């Protein structure tokens, strides 16, 4: 997170940390969709170019955290993975399209004041809340600048959704539909941005219709942290809804 600001305790009870067993370290953020299902960015387990092909028995999920280094005891929980489900048509070769992925926890965690699931949008909610101008909220432990360096506790920055045209024109990559870009325009005066260490991070928006928080995108890829004229790209969750409910209403 860049130019964000330390989060309040229990502000993101759905934040999930993708910790790597060995060597123990951060990897990606993630949200808790269900009581036995985690959702994170696909290129966090599979990305050939970097010989990154983690398997289930290679990582650990950690819910209920706020501090990035200490094993917040009594509060956080560490559940092992039981199976990694990646979208069969995740294009890691061209532009990280359909960069979504699910994870099944062996044993269902117990909710608390610091651990609560997030809602996935439907056709409606997403049909109204997904509009340029509206602001979403990104949260992560990633770097504090492209080049302190890292925060001490989960960072949080609210950002404005940018038009489709502005995204494309701000890059050389072919922008599909399973992705939208959020961020501030070089003149908007205000800054902020995701950054290396926020992958899979949950991008949510509080519904002004039922005070319920909805996750719209998934921190995917970027071109420089908080660089003017550029924006971050997230997975347009709703679209890949069909793949989600399917993977779940099956296994």
């Amino acid at each position: 997170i860049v130019e964000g600001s330390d989060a309040e305790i229990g502000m993101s009870p759905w934040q999930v940390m993708l910790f790597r067993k060995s060597p123990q370290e951060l990897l990606c953020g993630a949200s808790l969709i269900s009581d036995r299902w985690v959702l994170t960015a696909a290129h966090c387990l599979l990305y050939p170019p970097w010989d990154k092909n983690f398997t289930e028995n290679d990582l650990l999920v950690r819910i209920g955290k706020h501090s990035r280094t200490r094993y917040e005891r009594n509060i956080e929980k560490i559940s092992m993975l039981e199976k990694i489900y990646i979208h069969p048509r995740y294009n890691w070769r061209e532009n990280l399209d359909r960069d979504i992925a699910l994870m099944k926890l062996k044993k269902p965690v117990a909710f608390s004041d610091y651990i609560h699931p997030v809602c996935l949008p439907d056709r409606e909610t997403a049909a109204s809340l997904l509009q340029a101008g509206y602001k979403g909220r990104v949260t992560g432990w990633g770097n504090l600048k492209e080049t302190k360096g890292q925060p001490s506790v989960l960072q949080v920055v609210n950002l404005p959704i940018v038009e489709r045209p502005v995204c494309k024109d701000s890059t050389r990559i072919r922008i599909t539909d399973n992705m939208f870009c959020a961020g501030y325009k070089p003149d908007e005066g205000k800054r902020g941005d995701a950054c290396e260490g926020d992958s899979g991070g949950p991008f949510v928006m509080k519904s002004p219709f039922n005070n319920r928080w909805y996750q719209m995108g998934i921190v995917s890829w970027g071109e420089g942290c908080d660089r003017d004229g550029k924006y971050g790209f997230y997975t347009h969750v709703f679209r890949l809804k069909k793949w989600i409910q399917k993977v779940i209403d099956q296994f």
């Binding site: 123990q24 990035r68 200490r70 560490i78």
Partner: peptide, 11 residues
Amino acid sequence: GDFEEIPEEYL
């Protein structure tokens, strides 16, 4: 290596 030590039980 800079983070905190997690109980083996989880590893």
